[PDB]
């Protein structure tokens, strides 16, 4: 079921925007709601895969700061444009169910990725729940990882690791380990570096993982279809994965 990362697949291309479901779908959606970030303010909705015209089209109550956003259990989890503010927004519903200031974290610029946007303050879902990556001035630039609480925001754990956030290209985490991919000149990247939050045990990995642009991509581990997800700007990839 969970182990840790021993292989990465090639990057298989799948309206043009950010699609994004929910890998704990919640009545009345199914595994076939999927939803699109017009690319920054309206949520397209379709119910079947064949509609993927809208069912539905939600008018979110602020902008998206990035496309590093989240489906979970009923609700979109995103960041509003020029803050540090995660919001929840329960999509049946169309109700801001809780609003959080990230402590600390750094926003708009600070702490980036190797290849820049604002890509500060990422979500992400895994095996064990909800989780925000980013940094603060007080870990120096060292990624930090929180696990949030999907009713309310409240962060339930967090930990500094030993990796300069603005020295990876980007991050994502499976069954509570957090993987960083290097940003090398070259497409030969690697998944470089893990935080096991388990343990707390960090290493140095060598596993290649093939990235296309030097951009800084929305990836979104889905653990229910135990694939990553990757939006580079022109497409929607996804990886499959090999766990030990």
């Not at 090639?10 to 970030?37: A, C, F, H, S």
Request: some cysteine; proline content about 5%; charged content about 20%.
């Amino acid at each position: 079921g969970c182990g840790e990362l021993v292989w990465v697949g090639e990057p298989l291309t799948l309206k043009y925007g950010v699609w994004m479901r929910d890998p704990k779908p919640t009545y009345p959606y199914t595994q076939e709601t999927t939803w699109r970030i017009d690319t920054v303010r309206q949520v397209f909705e379709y119910d079947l895969i064949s509609q993927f015209y809208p069912s539905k089209v939600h008018i979110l109550p602020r902008p998206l700061e990035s496309t590093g956003a989240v489906v979970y259990s009923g609700s979109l989890y995103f960041q509003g444009a020029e803050s540090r503010t995660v919001i929840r927004y329960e999509l049946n519903t169309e109700t801001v169910k809780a609003e959080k200031e990230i402590p600390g974290a750094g926003y708009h610029g600070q702490f980036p990725y190797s290849w820049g946007g604002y890509t500060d303050i990422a979500l992400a879902v895994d095996e064990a729940g909800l989780w925000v990556i980013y940094s603060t001035d007080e870990a120096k630039g060292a990624i930090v990882l929180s696990k949030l609480n999907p009713e309310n925001l409240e962060l339930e754990q967090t930990w500094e690791t030993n990796i300069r956030k603005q020295s990876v290209a980007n991050a994502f985490i499976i069954c509570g380990t957090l993987y960083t991919v290097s940003s090398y000149t070259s497409a030969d990247a690697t998944v470089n570096f893990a935080y096991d939050t388990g343990t707390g045990i960090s290493k140095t990995l060598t596993i290649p993982f093939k990235n296309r642009y030097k951009y800084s991509s929305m990836i979104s581990y889905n653990p229910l279809e135990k694939k990553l997800f990757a939006w580079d700007n022109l497409n929607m990839v996804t990886y499959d994965i090999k766990l030990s």
